[PDB]
Design an enzyme around this catalytic site. Structure first.
Site, PDB file in Angstrom:
ATOM      1  N   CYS A  15       3.724  12.651  -3.437  1.00  0.00           N
ATOM      2  CA  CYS A  15       2.858  11.494  -3.247  1.00  0.00           C
ATOM      3  C   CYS A  15       2.587  11.207  -1.775  1.00  0.00           C
ATOM      4  O   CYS A  15       1.565  10.578  -1.452  1.00  0.00           O
ATOM      5  CB  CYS A  15       3.445  10.273  -3.990  1.00  0.00           C
ATOM      6  N   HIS A 320       7.690   5.415  -1.497  1.00  0.00           N
ATOM      7  CA  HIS A 320       6.909   5.815  -2.674  1.00  0.00           C
ATOM      8  C   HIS A 320       5.510   5.382  -2.275  1.00  0.00           C
ATOM      9  O   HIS A 320       5.203   4.189  -2.335  1.00  0.00           O
ATOM     10  CB  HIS A 320       7.306   5.135  -3.993  1.00  0.00           C
TER      11      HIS A 320
END
Ligand code: ATP
Ligand code: ATP
Ligand code: ATP
Ligand code: ATP
Ligand code: MG
Ligand code: MG
Ligand code: MG
Ligand code: MG
Lengths: 372, 361, 328, 262, 76, 348, 50
Positions: A15, A320
């Site tokens: 990501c 994240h």
């Protein structure tokens, strides 16, 4: 309004690339240049043989972008770019020790290295788009017994230095282009303290502002992240960090542009109770742009906020990344890219990305000259 | 190291030094020769914010002279032992009193009302510095200075300006702050305003407004103004000597002096009484020019013309004439602030729109 | 703050020594700042904004309505003066620095009830794109006094934390009218929150980008300690609509109304005396009731005649027909 | 159901420890203060819909480390019991029969817009707002209101005029402020304020009733009814027969549109 | 060759380093006085990151310049 | 050793204080802890049973709950600030003109204090209780500091409203425990200082605060008169207007003598002028008598502001002396600023 | 001690609430069970709204 955009899925631990890319293709010229790549694009030599790996990165962005625009799709693969990044800079192929695969890091650095590749291939006319020029005066405190002006000081993105005086981004930027530079060489004596002011003499056409979000605690000898609410406005006016010369001209043009912008803001709401309307306002705006326009110039000192990379959870070494980008036809309608999970989000969600707590906060903020 | 409870000391009571054959205790025990029977040494009872009290033989690193019978000490929270001594704590509201690096405006950015500036400097500032000439002459220093009169005469401004200039500690207090729904906790704002004040002396206790505590009433039949006045009666208790009112001062501004209690009339409390008059002809001209210092203006204006056309104005209204000049200026579309715009800010904004109804006058 | 540990008061009431944990600067930690400390052993985990006493000020922060600037409580220069005092220095401080003046922050909104004094400020609230915090003056009164001093104070400092916000003090005709001492009454307990409203506006530091509006039904009784021209500066009276101003309002009211052509809005202004634009806002709805008895999808001139006649008779039947609530 | 509840009960107790929601933070946390007196800086599991919970909500915290397990909508206070009905007003239309010309000013502007927004889409503009009933005693004024709210079945709050006045001060206007927040929360809304002549003839003590109380309550009610709030459509029905106990900002129309004489 | 380095907290310190020295030397001298290891250090000049295998004069950085220090982050 | 001493204290544990509430048996006692709740506890043999009486402070263990030892009386943290108040002390004659009131004060206070025995012959209830009331600035409290210093007896003293708590009947317990302390103490003088809100009447159409007044007031009535009647501990009550007080605080036989100290007389101002001019420097000033008499309006505190103001006229002239040329502009000026509001009071 | 010059009894204020409910109590669930037996020293020292 908008289609139903597609995202990148992960290959696992992916990501950090996916989130950042979404934002880069929002930038108008960036998406154009890769799309329109030929084998007829040049390079800039001064010593590097890494210029041919630079080409390889540009095909993988073109086709990653191609999947993005196509709707035969629910997954954009990042896969050939990941290998190509690891080849180009082999510090991502370091092993994580008692962790996961080939090393993952970092939205800031990432943009720096991809922009390095792009400025070689697409020439200097593209280098100047993000490049910021200052007038720096390095000048004594009390009467000047030595002066040097550096216009060889440059950046390609501004640094908001969080001193804990950050309650607004503008504040820390404005006193982060004021700093005191200490000397060590007899110019009027060794360690004479100089007041230094950088004022902007050339805005870019695309402004990038990176938050410094990190601290090294010297009081435990361990790195941390700090966060804290630092509000960024939607409409950023940077008039007060320019030199007078550049400002008067951009602020005069801005006032005419505000009148058209005002007629838009009324008119948009009426007809509701997009691409064609957008094109008419752009045509109206360009008449009021000054006739001195060139690559890398903003015809305003006003910007709107088109993208946020966010980082969540605990202290640094942890992230994240999702990203949020604003629509290319709309300005209160934003898409949330949670890898291949795509959703519509509102203006309120965007405000909260100023941080505080232990979750999502801004690291990188992407603008573009004036509004839409 | 942390963590550890913070407690207060009830008392030091002290059991006799252990060299005795017969315990070591003031309060003697049964049985013949003791030393470590149930005889222990020097004793401190501390009272906790865990809502109990404990008798301990305390640590001998820290003296019964480093223990007061109301001193704030660490107590170890794992097991209650006087661990060490800590500074006395005042409320966060009382910790908002001290300066932020408070801007100075000296006596020279206050134009007009000259005689008042001199009367304040005399009352507060110079008895702090020249306290030596006060002792040799043998006078006392006053216990505070009252400021009274109409709103807009620069009372609140002056106090900030003069406190910062010699950098006597400007304690920042609002009268309504003392009035809290928590009883015997509003009164600790009054008490710690003096507990703080003597450490930070020479000092100025600036209560902005005196009317939230200062009431005419103190016989109050059938109302809850008997809780309010208890930050007023505790205030006069600390403007009576236990000494520490000779470098600890009080400034007070108030808009109406007729609601004060008669125990604030009297000396030893507020001693000096400066009345702040509504500016005269020359005075007004000064004040107008002090705002015009900051802003671009026309040079064809004369501050004496401007002083003719104002009749009974004060400095807040003259704030409302220099700023009002620039409203008229932007509306014309002019960079500079027209000399006609100064005259027209008087009439446009007085403090009222025309002179009222007339129907037979 | 003890210079190098801190003394915290838990919300358990229990006082403890804590220090800096694993992600905090000393710069981060201020005085009066809340901190999250670990439940089991007390040490600063995460700094937190100041003061959990505000929780009933989180009912008075509200989100702006959508009301176009174009809809106005009457077409006058009067809303343009509001646009010089509040609106323009927020968008462009460029002109107010060249003047070199410090923008006026205060304004009074006053005049007879029902002209749309709040209507012209709701229009401004969609417009400025700066946070609005709205206040009720009779929600600042509670059984134990000194509770309401606290409430007022915390709201105002929260606007000092913000930049580009507007605190609209509404309905301060109860708490904000002129103080007076009784001598037997419980009027003193109410006069406490009046004094707190004065001492926050001026501060010990001047306003940190707080535009202040006062909504008053009355100019007639207000405190000279809130009516002083140094914190309310330029004050623009939004007075009764005219024979033309009433036609203007009614042109908006009948624009939003599906109607049939042949109407005279100049006529309606003749028929009504100096009277509210809330009267004219009820011409249309009562004309919509005469439309519905007949069964129409439209209104015409005629049903505006009857509607106007009804509202006028009721005005006589009551008081406040042009009234200021007397005086100046 | 079966596999969803497995992982529903994983993060649920045993004790579910009610909190009070002071403020939200937007990172999936909030600062709660419990009824048992310790604060918690709580997380939020993120299946209960993160922003669907607002100050004054009652929250379910986990028996271990506190996460907002879930959120309770409704927590019955005895203070909204007073407003809310416990009986049905079985006498409705034509048991107050007659005054069939003064029921077209409460069923062509109170009942009927709620039943048919159809007729009011046709004219456009904003629908009727409020009514004031007055006239001589025994003209059915009190029952008329209860008879149109029986038939629409809209949220019937009914508050007596003599409970707004308390012998306690400042909590009077807070009671009146509650009543309209419930109305705005419930989209179809009729609030019967029975008796608001009982605000200028009624007073207790002189330190917590009296004039000051009477002024405050009147002003609270303007903000509530329309003021600046821009709240949900509330029809207001006022019984009175002393029509100078009411503001000169309330008996202007455009809040109360047509006025009814009996 | 004298250069200036801007830290995380907007504080500029001095550094004396040659035009023939790698970025590993720059981060080494900075690691002494901040206690921060090279592998977290990011030295920026002209918006471009200054990689460790290239020297100082490969980015055409000569004296009277100011470099900007920021720290990395990991994960994925 | 200074650090060795720290180890032996640190390895010890605390103890929990109670008082013996009630004997149950002989090896089990009911105590009421200072943590609050009552317990049933046993005893160490080191404590003797007949030194265990009720109201005697004991240690308990904090893991066994057993008396190890008897502890001295507990005492308030607050009353240790009160013996640290006697500052502001002055001579026997330290209020001029109200000298007649000092003599009247000592009749009640100091004459039974030294010898209660001269009143045995007389046969009356021992003189107890004094009320002082006046217009502020006459040294009702300045007198209290003089009668603490001169006699040299144990002295306390009370802050105004800092013995008002947030707990109703906890603000009763404190004032209860200073009376006990004062009865253990030989010849103690107890000054209640500026009681005006801590002596109110019944109200209770107010707030909840007025029930704190009322709880705390009832405590005074039992103490003064019950099975405590004071003959060596003395009560002095200072108030600023004596109809702020409830009439059980205006009840003689708890307040035998109610002494008014007035505003200084025409020539009671003069008596202060002669003592405060020896507290300053002068070239010589003995020309008070006419001028001060006819610039009347002053109270006793305003005599010392005329002194300070003569040192401001001095500062203008640049002098370190009080000249009568300095002073008589002072008495003119102090008088005029005091015309600001009356001090009109009607006393019994 | 002021509540009978206030409104003629503050009890009579609460009584008006009681009695105003009572105007519909003969039909809600069928037929009054809760009688409100009011009592007073004379019937003339009640307001005429009762
Ligand atoms: N004599 C003066 N000279 C200069 N400006 C003045 C003068 N008096 C007032 N002002 C201007 O008016 C402003 C407002 O008045 P200020 O608040 O200082 O007065 P005040 O008499 O204490 O009243 P309030 O207690 O109502 O605030 C000052 O901050 C200053 O800008
Ligand atoms: N000129 C107008 N145009 C349209 N509607 C209006 C106008 N004036 C008043 N109204 C109606 O009245 C409503 C409430 O009025 P508002 O709250 O704007 O009052 P105000 O002028 O502040 O007077 P008050 O003293 O009564 O508070 C508005 O929301 C709107 O429906
Ligand atoms: N038109 C009517 N038909 C049937 N009953 C009626 C009618 N008008 C009134 N009544 C009866 O008269 C009584 C009083 O009227 P109601 O309580 O409805 O309101 P009001 O006019 O405020 O009078 P009050 O409160 O003084 O009794 C009730 O029992 C009601 O049913
Ligand atoms: N009689 C006096 N003679 C000399 N100094 C005085 C006299 N009265 C008051 N003062 C000066 O004023 C100070 C404070 O006055 P003090 O508290 O003694 O008055 P009080 O009469 O007890 O007032 P209140 O009734 O308001 O408590 C004294 O410590 C002293 O410096
Ligand atoms: Mg002020
Ligand atoms: Mg209003
Ligand atoms: Mg009825
Ligand atoms: Mg005294």
């Amino acid at each position: 309004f908008a289609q139903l955009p597609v995202g990148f899925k992960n290959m696992g631990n992916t990501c950090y690339l996916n989130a950042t890319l979404q934002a880069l293709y929002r930038v108008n010229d960036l998406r154009d240049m890769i799309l329109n790549y030929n084998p007829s694009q040049g390079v800039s030599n001064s010593g590097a043989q890494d210029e041919e790996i630079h080409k390889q990165i540009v095909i993988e962005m073109k086709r990653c972008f191609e999947n993005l625009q196509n709707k035969s799709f629910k997954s954009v693969l990042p896969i050939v770019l990941l290998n190509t990044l690891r080849k180009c800079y082999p510090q991502f192929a370091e092993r994580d020790s008692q962790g996961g695969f080939y090393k993952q890091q970092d939205a800031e650095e990432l943009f720096t290295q991809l922009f390095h590749s792009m400025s070689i291939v697409f020439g200097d006319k593209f280098s100047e788009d993000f490049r910021i020029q200052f007038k720096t005066t390095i000048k004594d405190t009390a009467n000047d017994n030595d002066i040097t002006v550096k216009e060889n000081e440059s950046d390609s993105k501004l640094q908001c230095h969080i001193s804990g005086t950050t309650n607004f981004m503008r504040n820390g930027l404005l006193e982060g282009l004021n700093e005191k530079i200490e000397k060590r060489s007899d110019l009027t004596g060794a360690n004479s303290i100089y007041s230094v002011e950088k004022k902007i003499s050339r805005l870019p056409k695309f402004l990038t502002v990176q938050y410094v979000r990190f601290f090294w605690k010297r009081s435990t000898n361990k790195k941390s992240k700090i966060l804290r609410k630092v509000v960024f406005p939607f409409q950023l006016d940077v008039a007060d960090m320019l030199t007078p010369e550049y400002a008067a001209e951009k602020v005069k043009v801005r006032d005419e542009l505000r009148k058209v912008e005002k007629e838009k803001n009324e008119k948009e709401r009426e007809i509701k109770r997009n691409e064609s309307e957008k094109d008419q306002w752009l045509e109206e705006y360009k008449k009021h742009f000054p006739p001195n326009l060139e690559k890398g110039e903003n015809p305003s000192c006003v910007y709107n906020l088109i993208g946020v990379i966010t980082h969540q959870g605990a202290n640094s070494e942890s992230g994240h990344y999702q990203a949020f980008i604003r629509d290319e036809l709309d300005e209160n309608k934003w898409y949330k890219f949670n890898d291949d999970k795509v959703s519509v989000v509102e203006k309120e969600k965007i405000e909260s990305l100023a941080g505080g707590g232990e979750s999502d906060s801004a690291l990188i903020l992407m603008y573009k000259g004036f509004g839409l | 190291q942390l963590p550890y409870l913070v407690a207060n000391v009830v008392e030091v009571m002290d059991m006799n030094e252990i060299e005795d054959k017969e315990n070591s205790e003031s309060t003697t025990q049964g049985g013949n020769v003791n030393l470590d029977n149930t005889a222990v040494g020097k004793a401190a009872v501390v009272k906790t914010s865990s809502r109990q009290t404990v008798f301990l033989p305390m640590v001998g690193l820290v003296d019964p002279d480093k223990l007061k019978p109301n001193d704030l000490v660490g107590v170890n929270k794992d097991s209650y032992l006087i661990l060490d001594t800590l500074p006395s704590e005042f409320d966060s509201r009382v910790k908002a009193m001290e300066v932020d690096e408070k801007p100075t405006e000296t006596y020279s950015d206050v134009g007009g009302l000259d005689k008042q500036i001199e009367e304040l400097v005399e009352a507060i500032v110079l008895p702090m510095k020249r306290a030596d000439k006060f002792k040799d002459m043998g006078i006392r220093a006053p216990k505070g200075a009252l400021m009274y009169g109409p709103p807009g005469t620069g009372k609140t401004l002056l106090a900030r300006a003069c406190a910062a200039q010699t950098n006597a500690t400007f304690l920042k207090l609002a009268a309504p702050q003392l009035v809290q729904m928590y009883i015997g906790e509003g009164a600790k704002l009054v008490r710690d305003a003096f507990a703080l004040a003597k450490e930070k002396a020479p000092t100025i206790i600036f209560i902005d407004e005196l009317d939230a505590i200062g009431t005419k009433r103190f016989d109050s039949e059938k109302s809850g103004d008997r809780e309010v006045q208890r930050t007023m009666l505790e205030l006069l208790n600390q403007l009576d000597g236990f000494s520490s009112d000779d470098r600890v001062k009080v400034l007070a501004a108030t808009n109406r002096v007729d609601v004060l209690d008669p125990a604030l009339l009297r000396s030893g409390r507020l001693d000096r009484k400066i009345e702040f008059p509504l500016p005269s002809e020359d005075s007004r001209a000064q004040i107008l020019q002090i705002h015009s210092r900051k802003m671009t203006t026309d040079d064809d204006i004369n501050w004496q013309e401007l002083a003719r056309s104002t009749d009974e104005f004060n400095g807040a209204q003259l704030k409302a004439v220099t700023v009002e000049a620039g409203m008229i200026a932007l509306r014309n579309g002019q960079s500079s602030v027209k000399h006609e715009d100064f005259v027209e800010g008087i009439s446009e904004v007085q403090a009222r729109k025309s002179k009222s109804v007339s129907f037979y006058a | 703050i003890i210079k190098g540990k801190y003394v915290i008061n838990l919300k358990q009431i229990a006082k403890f020594v804590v220090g800096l944990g694993e992600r905090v600067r000393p710069k981060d930690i201020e005085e009066g700042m809340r901190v999250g400390v670990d439940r089991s052993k007390y040490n600063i985990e995460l700094p937190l904004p100041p003061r959990i006493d505000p929780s009933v000020t989180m009912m008075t922060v509200e989100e702006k309505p959508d009301v176009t600037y174009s809809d106005v409580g009457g077409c006058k220069d009067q809303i343009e003066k509001l646009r010089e005092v509040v609106e323009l220095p927020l968008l462009s401080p460029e002109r107010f620095a060249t003047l070199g003046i410090d923008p006026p922050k205060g304004i009074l909104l006053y005049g007879p009830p029902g002209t749309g004094k709040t209507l012209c400020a709701r229009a401004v609230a969609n417009r400025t794109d700066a946070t609005f915090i709205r206040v009720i003056g009779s929600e600042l009164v509670q059984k134990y006094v000194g509770e309401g001093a606290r409430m007022v104070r915390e709201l105002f400092e929260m606007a000092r934390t913000k930049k580009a916000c507007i605190i609209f003090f509404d309905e301060i005709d109860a708490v904000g009218g002129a103080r007076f001492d009784d001598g037997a009454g419980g009027d003193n307990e109410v006069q406490r929150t009046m004094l707190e409203l004065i001492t926050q506006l001026d501060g010990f530091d001047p306003r940190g980008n707080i535009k202040v509006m006062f909504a008053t039904n009355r100019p007639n009784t207000l405190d000279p300690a809130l009516l002083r021209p140094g914190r309310i500066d330029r004050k623009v009276e939004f007075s009764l609509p005219d024979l033309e101003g009433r036609a203007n309002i009614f042109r908006i009211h009948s624009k939003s109304m599906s109607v049939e052509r042949g109407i005279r809005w100049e006529l309606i202004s003749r028929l009504c005396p100096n009277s509210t634009g809330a009267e004219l806002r009820s011409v249309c709805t009562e004309a919509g009731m005469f439309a519905i008895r007949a069964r129409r999808k439209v209104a015409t001139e005629k049903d505006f005649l009857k509607a106007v006649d009804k509202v006028i008779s009721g005005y006589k039947k009551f008081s406040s027909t042009s009234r200021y609530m007397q005086y100046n | 159901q079966e596999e969803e509840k497995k992982q529903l009960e994983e993060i649920r107790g045993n004790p579910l420890s009610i909190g009070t929601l002071e403020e939200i933070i937007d990172d999936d946390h909030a600062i709660v203060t419990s009824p048992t007196m310790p604060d918690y800086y709580v997380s939020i599991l993120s299946f209960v819909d993160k922003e669907l919970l607002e100050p004054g909500c009652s929250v379910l915290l986990h028996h271990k480390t506190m996460s907002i397990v879930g959120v309770l909508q409704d927590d019955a206070d005895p203070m909204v019991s007073v407003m809310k009905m416990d009986k049905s007003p079985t006498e409705s239309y034509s048991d107050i029969g007659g005054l069939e010309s003064q029921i077209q000013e409460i069923k062509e502007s109170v009942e009927l817009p709620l039943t048919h927004p159809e007729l009011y889409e046709e004219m456009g503009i904003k629908p009727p707002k409020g009514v004031i009933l007055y006239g001589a005693p025994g003209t059915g004024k009190t029952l008329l209101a209860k008879a149109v709210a029986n038939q629409t079945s809209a949220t019937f709050l009914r508050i007596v005029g003599s409970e707004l006045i308390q012998k306690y001060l400042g909590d009077g206007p807070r009671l009146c402020r509650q009543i309209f927040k419930v109305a705005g929360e419930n989209a179809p809304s009729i609030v019967f304020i029975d008796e608001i002549d009982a605000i200028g003839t009624k007073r207790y003590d002189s330190n917590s009733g009296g004039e000051r109380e009477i002024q405050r309550t009147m002003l609270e009610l303007l903000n509530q009814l329309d003021g600046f709030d821009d709240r949900g459509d509330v029809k207001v029905i006022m019984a009175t027969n002393k029509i100078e106990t009411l503001d000169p900002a309330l008996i202007r129309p455009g809040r109360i549109d047509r006025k009814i004489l009996f | 060759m004298q250069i200036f380095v801007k830290t995380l907290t907007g504080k500029t310190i001095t550094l004396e380093v040659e035009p023939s020295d790698t970025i590993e030397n720059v981060k080494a001298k900075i690691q002494d006085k901040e206690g921060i290891p090279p592998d977290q250090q990011r030295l920026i000049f002209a918006g471009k990151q200054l990689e460790d295998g290239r020297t100082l004069s490969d980015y055409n950085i000569q004296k009277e310049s100011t470099l900007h220090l920021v720290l990395r982050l990991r994960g994925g | 050793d200074k650090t060795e001493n720290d180890i032996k204290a640190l390895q010890s544990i605390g103890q929990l204080i109670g008082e013996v509430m009630k004997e149950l048996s002989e090896e089990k006692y009911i105590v009421k802890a200072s943590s609050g709740p009552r317990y049933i506890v046993g005893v160490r043999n080191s404590v003797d049973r007949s030194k265990l009486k009720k109201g005697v402070r004991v240690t308990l263990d904090i893991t066994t709950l057993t008396i190890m030892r008897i502890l001295p009386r507990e005492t308030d943290p607050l009353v240790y600030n009160m013996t640290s108040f006697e500052q502001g002390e002055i001579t026997f004659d330290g209020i001029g003109g109200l000298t007649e009131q000092i003599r009247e004060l000592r009749e009640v206070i100091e004459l039974p204090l030294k010898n209660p025995e001269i009143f045995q012959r007389v046969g009356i209830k021992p003189p107890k209780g004094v009320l002082l009331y006046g217009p502020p600035g006459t040294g009702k409290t300045l007198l209290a500091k003089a009668v603490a210093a001169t006699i040299g007896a144990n002295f306390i003293f009370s802050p105004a409203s800092g013995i008002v708590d947030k707990y109703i009947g906890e603000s009763a317990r404190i004032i209860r425990e200073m009376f006990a302390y004062a009865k253990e103490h030989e010849p103690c003088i107890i000054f209640m200082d500026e009681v005006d809100a801590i002596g109110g009447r019944r109200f209770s159409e107010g707030t909840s605060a007025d029930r704190e007044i009322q709880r705390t007031l009832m405590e005074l009535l039992t103490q003064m008169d019950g099975f405590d009647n004071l003959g060596q501990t003395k009560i002095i009550m200072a108030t600023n207007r004596p109809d702020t007080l409830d009439p059980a605080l205006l009840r003689p036989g708890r307040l035998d003598r109610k002494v008014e100290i007035p505003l200084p007389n025409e020539a009671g101002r003069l008596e202060i002028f002669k003592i405060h001019t020896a507290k300053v420097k002068k070239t010589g000033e003995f020309d008070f008598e006419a001028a001060v008499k006819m610039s009347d309006g002053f109270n006793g505190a305003d005599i010392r502001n005329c002194a300070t103001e003569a040192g401001f006229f001095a500062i203008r002239d640049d002098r370190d002396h009080i000249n009568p040329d300095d002073l008589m502009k002072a008495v003119r000026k102090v008088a005029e600023v005091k015309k600001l509001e009356g001090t009109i009071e009607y006393q019994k | 001690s002021t509540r009978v010059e206030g409104s003629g009894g503050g009890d009579s204020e609460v009584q008006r609430t009681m009695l105003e409910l009572l105007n519909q109590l003969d039909g809600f669930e069928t037929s009054k069970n809760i009688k409100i037996i009011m009592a007073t020293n004379r019937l003339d020292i009640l307001d005429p709204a009762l």
